[PDB]
């Protein structure tokens, strides 16, 4: 029942479990490979507001983990530190041997609070959370992941990362509010249309034009100024 990909006639196809192809040759277990593909590569929105709406909390379902051997360099990964309003953790510590996804251009680190109405956080579309060669059905605290799915195949016989920090309230609900963090006291209201590159230029021009908070209080700026990646309030304008 788990589909196995095989190449026939210059085309990848699913192997027919009911039809024996004696021409197919499997000469060692090395020819079998498991691959994790990123949801990114299918065109899903990757901004934090859009991505988090794909995740939700559920009780009663034991988490499950499956390994995979090769993965895809991600443009967007995520790393969550979510607590309830009373300060208890919403996500479990990463189990022994589960490390973060190894290749992320941008790590979106989200801290904040939500009601977290369930024991584990699952992908509402059935996808996996991809970590270091281990795909999980649930999200682990403080551990970088990419959203993805796993394929199984029979083959024929530098790295820069940047962390983008955000604060959240009402995480995991309809009315989630997100702030992009410039420093511990300067924030920008986050909109879905803001790209990672835009947030990094927004950060740099705030630092250089001195629009950071020079008080002890919290300064929050507002801003109002179809293409995939591979192809004290105020205002600014």
């Amino acid at each position: 029942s788990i589909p196995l990909g095989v190449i026939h006639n210059s085309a990848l196809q699913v192997s027919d479990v009911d039809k024996l192809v004696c021409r197919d040759k499997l000469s060692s277990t090395n020819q079998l490979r498991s691959v994790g593909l990123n949801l990114e590569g299918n065109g899903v929105a990757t901004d934090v507001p859009s991505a988090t709406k794909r995740w939700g909390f559920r009780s009663g379902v034991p988490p499950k983990v499956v390994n995979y051997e090769a993965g895809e360099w991600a443009e967007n990964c995520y790393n969550l530190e979510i607590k309830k309003p009373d300060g208890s953790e919403c996500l479990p510590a990463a189990p022994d041997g589960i490390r973060g996804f190894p290749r992320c251009r941008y790590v979106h680190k989200v801290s904040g609070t939500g009601p977290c109405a369930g024991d584990f956080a699952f992908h509402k579309e059935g996808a996996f959370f991809l970590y270091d060669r281990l795909a999980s059905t649930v999200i682990y605290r403080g551990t970088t992941f990419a959203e993805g799915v796993v394929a199984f195949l029979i083959l024929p016989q530098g790295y820069y990362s940047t962390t983008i920090r955000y604060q959240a309230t009402g995480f995991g609900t309809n009315e989630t509010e997100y702030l992009f963090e410039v420093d511990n006291l300067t924030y920008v209201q986050l909109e879905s249309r803001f790209t990672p590159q835009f947030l990094l230029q927004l950060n740099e021009t705030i630092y250089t034009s001195g629009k950071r908070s020079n008080t002890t209080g919290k300064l929050i700026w507002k801003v109002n100024p179809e293409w995939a990646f591979w192809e004290x309030x105020x205002x600014x304008x």
Binding site: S1, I2, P3, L4, G5, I7, S10, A11, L12, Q13, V14, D16, L20, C22, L26, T29, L32, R33, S34, V35, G36, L37, E40, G41, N42, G43, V44, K64, V65, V66, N67, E69, A70, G71, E72, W73, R99, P102, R103, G126, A127, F128, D132, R133, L134, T137, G148, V149, V150, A151, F152, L153, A228, W230
Partner: protein, 125 residues
């Protein structure tokens, strides 16, 4: 069955990372004490969409999820590492799990070269 990419988009290039178990390391780099940290065990490569294999693979992983999710729901194993080995076993059982009836469609024994052997011996006799 054929694979029909039904995704809204397809990144036609696969910049991938993996490990190399074969290693054949330089000097002493295979010794854990001296070798790379967890961050430095990865190789990389780039594959383009020849024969439409990258978009096919994205669709295949998408279509695999349901059966894979149903499998993980039914196992009591916390971390599953045995899927590929079990597929290798099932590859062998499909061909060799019963008596191999030569010339039968479910028997991958080719007697051609030996048919020509017996044939030439008969031409002699």
């Amino acid at each position: 069955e054929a694979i029909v990419n039904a995704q809204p988009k397809c990144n036609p290039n696969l910049h991938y990372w993996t490990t190399q178990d074969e290693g054949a390391a330089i000097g002493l780099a295979w010794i854990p004490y001296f070798g790379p940290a967890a961050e430095g065990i990865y190789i990389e490569g780039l594959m383009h969409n020849q024969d439409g294999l990258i978009c096919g693979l994205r669709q295949l992983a998408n279509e695999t999820t349901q059966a894979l999710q149903l499998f993980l729901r039914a196992t009591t194993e916390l971390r599953t590492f045995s899927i590929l080995n079990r597929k290798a076993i099932d590859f062998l059982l499909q061909r060799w799990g019963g008596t191999c009836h030569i010339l039968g469609p479910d028997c991958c024994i080719e007697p051609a070269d030996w048919t020509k052997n017996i044939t030439d011996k008969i031409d002699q006799i």
